[PDB]
Design an enzyme around this catalytic site. Structure first.
Site, PDB file in Angstrom:
ATOM      1  N   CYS A   5     -14.868   6.674  -3.314  1.00 58.68           N
ATOM      2  CA  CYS A   5     -14.202   5.424  -2.876  1.00 58.68           C
ATOM      3  C   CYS A   5     -12.863   5.130  -3.552  1.00 58.68           C
ATOM      4  O   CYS A   5     -12.792   4.893  -4.782  1.00 58.68           O
ATOM      5  CB  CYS A   5     -15.131   4.206  -3.040  1.00 58.68           C
ATOM      6  SG  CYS A   5     -14.458   2.602  -2.378  1.00 58.68           S
ATOM      7  N   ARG A  31     -12.025   1.158  -5.159  1.00 60.62           N
ATOM      8  CA  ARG A  31     -12.890   0.613  -6.193  1.00 60.62           C
ATOM      9  C   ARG A  31     -12.250  -0.387  -7.140  1.00 60.62           C
ATOM     10  O   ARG A  31     -12.948  -0.984  -7.942  1.00 60.62           O
ATOM     11  CB  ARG A  31     -13.603   1.721  -6.971  1.00 60.62           C
ATOM     12  CG  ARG A  31     -14.666   2.424  -6.137  1.00 60.62           C
ATOM     13  CD  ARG A  31     -15.343   3.492  -6.953  1.00 60.62           C
ATOM     14  NE  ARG A  31     -14.469   4.635  -7.148  1.00 60.62           N
ATOM     15  CZ  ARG A  31     -14.773   5.667  -7.922  1.00 60.62           C
ATOM     16  NH1 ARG A  31     -15.939   5.691  -8.538  1.00 60.62           N
ATOM     17  NH2 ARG A  31     -13.932   6.683  -8.050  1.00 60.62           N
ATOM     18  N   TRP A  85     -12.276  -3.836   3.590  1.00 62.21           N
ATOM     19  CA  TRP A  85     -11.246  -3.810   4.633  1.00 62.21           C
ATOM     20  C   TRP A  85     -10.688  -2.401   4.805  1.00 62.21           C
ATOM     21  O   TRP A  85     -10.917  -1.514   3.977  1.00 62.21           O
ATOM     22  CB  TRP A  85     -10.106  -4.782   4.340  1.00 62.21           C
ATOM     23  CG  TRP A  85      -9.564  -4.674   2.951  1.00 62.21           C
ATOM     24  CD1 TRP A  85      -8.626  -3.783   2.494  1.00 62.21           C
ATOM     25  CD2 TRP A  85      -9.922  -5.491   1.832  1.00 62.21           C
ATOM     26  NE1 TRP A  85      -8.380  -4.003   1.157  1.00 62.21           N
ATOM     27  CE2 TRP A  85      -9.157  -5.048   0.731  1.00 62.21           C
ATOM     28  CE3 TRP A  85     -10.803  -6.568   1.660  1.00 62.21           C
ATOM     29  CZ2 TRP A  85      -9.255  -5.639  -0.529  1.00 62.21           C
ATOM     30  CZ3 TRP A  85     -10.903  -7.154   0.408  1.00 62.21           C
ATOM     31  CH2 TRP A  85     -10.125  -6.692  -0.669  1.00 62.21           C
ATOM     32  N   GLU A 115      -7.731   5.304   8.031  1.00 65.67           N
ATOM     33  CA  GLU A 115      -9.093   5.401   8.544  1.00 65.67           C
ATOM     34  C   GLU A 115      -9.087   5.257  10.059  1.00 65.67           C
ATOM     35  O   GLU A 115      -9.793   5.979  10.756  1.00 65.67           O
ATOM     36  CB  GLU A 115     -10.006   4.362   7.909  1.00 65.67           C
ATOM     37  CG  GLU A 115     -10.223   4.573   6.407  1.00 65.67           C
ATOM     38  CD  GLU A 115     -11.172   3.532   5.822  1.00 65.67           C
ATOM     39  OE1 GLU A 115     -12.396   3.718   5.964  1.00 65.67           O
ATOM     40  OE2 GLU A 115     -10.710   2.522   5.244  1.00 65.67           O
TER      41      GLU A 115
HETATM   42  C1  HEM Z   1     -12.426  -3.381  -0.024  1.00 63.32           C
HETATM   43  C2  HEM Z   1     -11.681  -2.402   0.490  1.00 63.32           C
HETATM   44  C3  HEM Z   1     -12.167  -0.945   0.580  1.00 63.32           C
HETATM   45  C4  HEM Z   1     -11.361   0.063   0.919  1.00 63.32           C
HETATM   46  C5  HEM Z   1      -9.852  -0.040   1.255  1.00 63.32           C
HETATM   47  C6  HEM Z   1     -12.154   1.276   0.894  1.00 63.32           C
HETATM   48  C7  HEM Z   1     -11.704   2.539   1.200  1.00 63.32           C
HETATM   49  C8  HEM Z   1     -12.526   3.632   1.361  1.00 63.32           C
HETATM   50  C9  HEM Z   1     -12.178   4.870   2.014  1.00 63.32           C
HETATM   51  C10 HEM Z   1     -10.822   5.195   2.687  1.00 63.32           C
HETATM   52  C11 HEM Z   1     -13.231   5.682   1.919  1.00 63.32           C
HETATM   53  C12 HEM Z   1     -13.316   7.102   2.500  1.00 63.32           C
HETATM   54  C13 HEM Z   1     -14.048   6.922   3.822  1.00 63.32           C
HETATM   55  C14 HEM Z   1     -13.840   8.075   4.758  1.00 63.32           C
HETATM   56  O1  HEM Z   1     -12.659   8.400   5.035  1.00 63.32           O
HETATM   57  O2  HEM Z   1     -14.856   8.644   5.238  1.00 63.32           O
HETATM   58  C15 HEM Z   1     -14.295   4.986   1.223  1.00 63.32           C
HETATM   59  C16 HEM Z   1     -15.547   5.481   0.923  1.00 63.32           C
HETATM   60  C17 HEM Z   1     -16.607   4.797   0.360  1.00 63.32           C
HETATM   61  N1  HEM Z   1     -16.678   3.444   0.023  1.00 63.32           N
HETATM   62 FE1  HEM Z   1     -14.978   2.285  -0.131  1.00 63.32          FE
HETATM   63  N2  HEM Z   1     -13.457   0.957   0.531  1.00 63.32           N
HETATM   64  C18 HEM Z   1     -13.511  -0.414   0.336  1.00 63.32           C
HETATM   65  C19 HEM Z   1     -14.653  -1.113  -0.010  1.00 63.32           C
HETATM   66  C20 HEM Z   1     -15.913  -0.623  -0.309  1.00 63.32           C
HETATM   67  C21 HEM Z   1     -17.090  -1.424  -0.598  1.00 63.32           C
HETATM   68  C22 HEM Z   1     -17.115  -2.971  -0.595  1.00 63.32           C
HETATM   69  C23 HEM Z   1     -18.102  -0.591  -0.863  1.00 63.32           C
HETATM   70  C24 HEM Z   1     -19.579  -0.898  -1.241  1.00 63.32           C
HETATM   71  C25 HEM Z   1     -20.109  -2.106  -1.456  1.00 63.32           C
HETATM   72  C26 HEM Z   1     -17.597   0.755  -0.735  1.00 63.32           C
HETATM   73  C27 HEM Z   1     -18.327   1.901  -0.932  1.00 63.32           C
HETATM   74  C28 HEM Z   1     -17.925   3.138  -0.518  1.00 63.32           C
HETATM   75  C29 HEM Z   1     -18.749   4.320  -0.566  1.00 63.32           C
HETATM   76  C30 HEM Z   1     -20.204   4.427  -1.095  1.00 63.32           C
HETATM   77  C31 HEM Z   1     -17.864   5.418   0.027  1.00 63.32           C
HETATM   78  C32 HEM Z   1     -18.212   6.902   0.213  1.00 63.32           C
HETATM   79  C33 HEM Z   1     -18.841   7.070   1.584  1.00 63.32           C
HETATM   80  C34 HEM Z   1     -19.514   8.407   1.586  1.00 63.32           C
HETATM   81  O3  HEM Z   1     -19.876   8.879   0.467  1.00 63.32           O
HETATM   82  O4  HEM Z   1     -19.695   8.998   2.693  1.00 63.32           O
HETATM   83  N3  HEM Z   1     -16.262   0.711  -0.397  1.00 63.32           N
HETATM   84  N4  HEM Z   1     -13.822   3.738   0.883  1.00 63.32           N
HETATM   85  C1  LIG Z   2     -22.373   8.268  10.018  1.00 65.56           C
HETATM   86  N1  LIG Z   2     -22.624   8.600   8.606  1.00 65.56           N
HETATM   87  C2  LIG Z   2     -23.662   9.641   8.489  1.00 65.56           C
HETATM   88  C3  LIG Z   2     -21.363   9.038   7.975  1.00 65.56           C
HETATM   89  C4  LIG Z   2     -20.968   8.009   6.940  1.00 65.56           C
HETATM   90  C5  LIG Z   2     -21.920   7.071   6.567  1.00 65.56           C
HETATM   91  C6  LIG Z   2     -21.599   6.112   5.621  1.00 65.56           C
HETATM   92  C7  LIG Z   2     -20.332   6.087   5.049  1.00 65.56           C
HETATM   93  C8  LIG Z   2     -19.367   7.021   5.414  1.00 65.56           C
HETATM   94  O1  LIG Z   2     -18.125   6.974   4.813  1.00 65.56           O
HETATM   95  C9  LIG Z   2     -17.060   6.186   5.326  1.00 65.56           C
HETATM   96  C10 LIG Z   2     -16.858   4.850   4.627  1.00 65.56           C
HETATM   97  C11 LIG Z   2     -17.808   4.245   3.800  1.00 65.56           C
HETATM   98  C12 LIG Z   2     -17.538   3.001   3.203  1.00 65.56           C
HETATM   99  C13 LIG Z   2     -16.323   2.351   3.417  1.00 65.56           C
HETATM  100  C14 LIG Z   2     -16.029   1.110   2.834  1.00 65.56           C
HETATM  101  C15 LIG Z   2     -14.790   0.519   3.122  1.00 65.56           C
HETATM  102  C16 LIG Z   2     -13.854   1.178   3.945  1.00 65.56           C
HETATM  103  N2  LIG Z   2     -12.626   0.646   4.206  1.00 65.56           N
HETATM  104  N3  LIG Z   2     -14.169   2.373   4.492  1.00 65.56           N
HETATM  105  C17 LIG Z   2     -15.372   2.959   4.243  1.00 65.56           C
HETATM  106  C18 LIG Z   2     -15.649   4.190   4.831  1.00 65.56           C
HETATM  107  C19 LIG Z   2     -19.691   7.994   6.366  1.00 65.56           C
END
Ligand code: HEM
Ligand SMILES: CN(C)Cc1cccc(OCc2ccc3ccc(N)nc3c2)c1
Ligand code: HEM
Ligand SMILES: CN(C)Cc1cccc(OCc2ccc3ccc(N)nc3c2)c1
Ligand SMILES: C[C@H](O)[C@H](O)[C@H]1CNc2nc(N)[nH]c(=O)c2N1
Ligand SMILES: C[C@H](O)[C@H](O)[C@H]1CNc2nc(N)[nH]c(=O)c2N1
Ligand SMILES: [Zn+2]
Lengths: 411, 407
Positions: free
Chosen positions: A108, A111, A280, A285
């Protein structure tokens, strides 16, 4: 054992000790790196050490390690496990866990905001309708008329794995995808399989290119139920380009609240299988992945045609050019409507600061470079040149099998 | 133990067995991944030799033949006698081609079997090295029709007679720290442009000055040599749209020739082994031109485009970055100098990847390095899971000579 990472753009070296407190496994060995692999019923036998490890962390963070409150809590939890084979977290513990799971999300980039998570405790929920009501309140609160606030709603934990709460949608808000007889897809290709289920579950599909999917909610291991999110609660943004006037005529819009609903929240050995959370969007994305991935709306082509690009040779970089304009449109549209969004330059910049601060105050920050680096303009953001260490801390967010694969249908 | 990798854009699954033959180590453990980290005797020698000779003889369908067993015996003796050993020409060529084939960070490996190997093991002096290097440069350049080559100088013996090319590439531009405090030319080469002076280079303190070669033979003090300009093919950079592009005064060289790595074959160490191919466009346009720590010309280019450089969210860096890369490719192609775009290269790599899975049981690949520095997710490699592991023969990093050389 210490470890150092280096920023090759700025020569800044940082030192990691936090990785010592690492429990889970990465997938890698001394002989192989799985760094680019996407995806690398619990006994009392193995629950109390997990509970202790968590409680110790918690009481450390509040500076009450070894206190009486700390010890009495250990004993209370001890007795509850051996008596009931599980335990319940206090509200204080739950909030802490949820925030920390986010903080430990090595993938993430967002964070920096981790301490400001709004935690809704939905552990008293017993039905799907209850689940709908909770989700609606999440969506409204998080959306906040375009001024987005991070939130997570937490439904009851898994017990015997047979009474699971699940949100079947991968995100609370997402557009339908319909495969046509000719092979083309109408709508969002990523959601075809999910749309089919919904339709089969009795959804009446408007069959447009931007239909908001209904919610498919499962409580206490029962069959899932359909619910339509009230449209007044779904903030959507029309996509236009600040210079290109034909862009509006592409007919595109996206929704403002990215809210992932299919992950698993692990806190102190407890498993929260329905834990929808929202932040957000980072512009790419939507602008790069959602629109320009080959397996999505794939509008590179049409945007390129309308720009009159030389689409003959790929060496004209017509794809690269179009991709940038589409991302330009996305940020523009969102900002014009005063819907919170962040560009990848700003987001990655913020992350490096967060990361440095985390090293100073916490002794490390696990980060997955493969996921932190944005899907365009990699090397002109500062995370590209930043070395990162990856490892897994708990509490954490984990993947889980799709529910339609594991569910036992009652009828 | 039999690993699988998925391409998430095409659902294709390949299975990997080749990793089980991996000899070296990764930096990673079960507890922590180091994937994004830049740099992670007689009885040692024979098993090393044997491993190489076994795979060599297997590759020519003569595993366990007389020749094979004879050769193992022969090398065994030379080691026991001389404490080192010498490769046959056939083995040397096979080893070099395979060090490239095994380079997990290299996107261009579809070309691996077409490497020209020049044996310079009979070399004794810096003047000698210069001659061999000039010949390499002329051959590889080939009037713009680039050909991959490697030139291999004598192997290490006891670490006191090392051959080394001090340059990081055979051809690179000079960089000088100014009294102004800024930096003229190429900032990557400020320290090296300095050392050229410490050993007596007469720097035409300009911008795109081709650095002199600084060659060390047999562990001796290194000597300066100036590459004949008619051997250094360069490309003036112009945009096919912006006439004002030429005004920026930009050019780059066509021959990317890496000269600071260490080639390992069957336990032997070739510390001077300059090798070359041709550029992927983004190496110059994204990294060389736009890195903060390099020519960093983004600001300027965006200015002539009159972009709103007031807010990051205009993505002006992005817009300009693309134009710059369009120009680079355009210039090279218009000058008939070999170059490949990142779209073509990555596509060829997925193809190569599929071939290696099919005819070898896999392909070690480092995603952090295979995915280009721009337009990552619109190339097929972004969605390709890869496995990274270290096979031998191989190219390795080695310390900068000045940090080492007994003077
Ligand atoms: C607040 C603004 C936030 C932004 C701008 C942001 C941005 C991102 C981005 C760009 C990714 C990569 C997603 C992808 O391209 O597949 C990501 C992943 C992730 N986010 Fe954040 N995020 C935010 C908030 C959060 C919040 C609130 C949580 C949890 C409470 C969170 C938990 C995660 C987790 C667990 C992943 C990894 C997903 C995975 O492992 O497949 N994010 N985030
Ligand atoms: C469909 N799932 C198996 C794929 C998957 C499941 C859950 C999360 C994920 O990653 C993308 C992701 C996760 C959390 C986010 C939080 C905020 C944000 N802006 N983008 C996020 C983007 C991808
Ligand atoms: C012929 C066309 C070739 C292309 C298009 C190509 C492309 C590339 C690219 C883009 C990189 C990334 C390096 C960076 O961005 O800094 C790279 C690295 C590398 N290349 Fe290739 N290359 C080619 C030929 C060769 C040859 C002939 C060799 C050796 C015989 C070779 C060996 C390597 C090695 C060992 C690396 C990784 C070095 C490191 O660890 O930093 N390449 N190549
Ligand atoms: C000063 N050093 C850090 C530079 C250096 C040392 C060692 C390896 C290295 O990798 C870049 C590299 C290596 C081989 C290549 C072959 C062809 C090509 N087009 N680019 C390459 C680019 C770069
Ligand atoms: C910190 C990180 O390891 C470093 O910036 C790497 C990332 N990926 C790269 N990829 C390529 N092709 N070339 C590089 O120099 C780098 N640098
Ligand atoms: C193969 C690889 O694991 C997969 O394509 C990853 C690469 N990096 C990514 N990075 C982000 N932010 N999101 C993704 O979905 C992916 N996909
Ligand atoms: Zn790893």
């Amino acid at each position: 054992r210490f470890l150092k990472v280096k920023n090759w753009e700025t020569d800044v070296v940082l030192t990691d000790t936090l990785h010592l407190k690492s429990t889970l496994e990465t997938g890698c060995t001394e002989h192989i790196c799985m760094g680019s692999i996407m995806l690398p019923v619990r006994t009392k036998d193995q629950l109390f050490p997990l509970a202790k490890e968590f409680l110790d962390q918690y009481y450390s963070s509040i500076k009450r390690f070894g206190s009486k409150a700390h010890m009495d809590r250990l004993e209370e939890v001890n007795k509850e496990i051996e008596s009931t084979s599980t335990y319940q977290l206090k509200d204080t513990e739950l909030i802490y866990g949820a925030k920390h799971a986010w903080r430990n999300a090595s993938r993430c980039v967002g964070r920096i905001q981790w301490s400001k998570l709004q935690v809704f405790d939905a552990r008293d929920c017993t039905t799907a309708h209850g689940m709908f009501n909770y989700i609606c309140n999440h969506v409204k609160y998080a959306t906040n008329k375009g001024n987005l606030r991070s939130a997570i709603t937490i439904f009851p934990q898994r017990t015997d794995g047979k009474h699971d709460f699940r949100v079947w949608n991968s995100q609370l808000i997402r557009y339908a995808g319909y495969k046509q007889p000719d092979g083309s897809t109408l709508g969002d290709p990523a959601n075809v399989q999910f749309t089919e289920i919904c339709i089969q579950q009795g959804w009446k599909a408007p069959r447009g290119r931007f239909d908001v999917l209904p919610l498919l909610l499962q409580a206490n291991g029962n069959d899932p139920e359909l619910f339509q999110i009230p449209p007044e609660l779904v903030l959507e943004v029309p996509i236009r380009h600040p210079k290109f006037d034909w862009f509006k005529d592409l007919g595109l819009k996206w929704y403002g609240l990215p809210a992932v609903s299919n992950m698993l929240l692990e806190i102190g050995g407890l498993e929260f299988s329905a834990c929808p959370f929202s932040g957000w969007y980072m512009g790419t994305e939507i602008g790069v992945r959602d629109y320009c991935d080959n397996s999505r709306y794939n509008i590179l082509e049409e945007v390129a045609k309308k720009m009159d690009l030389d689409m003959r040779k790929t060496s004209s970089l017509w794809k690269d050019q179009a991709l940038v304009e589409i991302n330009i449109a996305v940020l523009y549209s969102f900002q014009s409507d005063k819907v919170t969004i962040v560009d990848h330059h700003s987001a990655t910049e913020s992350f490096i600061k967060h990361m440095e601060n985390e090293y100073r105050c916490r002794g490390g920050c696990p980060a997955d470079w493969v996921w932190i680096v944005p899907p365009m303009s990699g090397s002109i953001t500062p995370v590209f040149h930043q070395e990162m260490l990856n490892y897994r801390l708990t509490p954490s967010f984990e993947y889980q099998p799709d529910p339609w694969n594991t569910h036992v249908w009652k009828g």
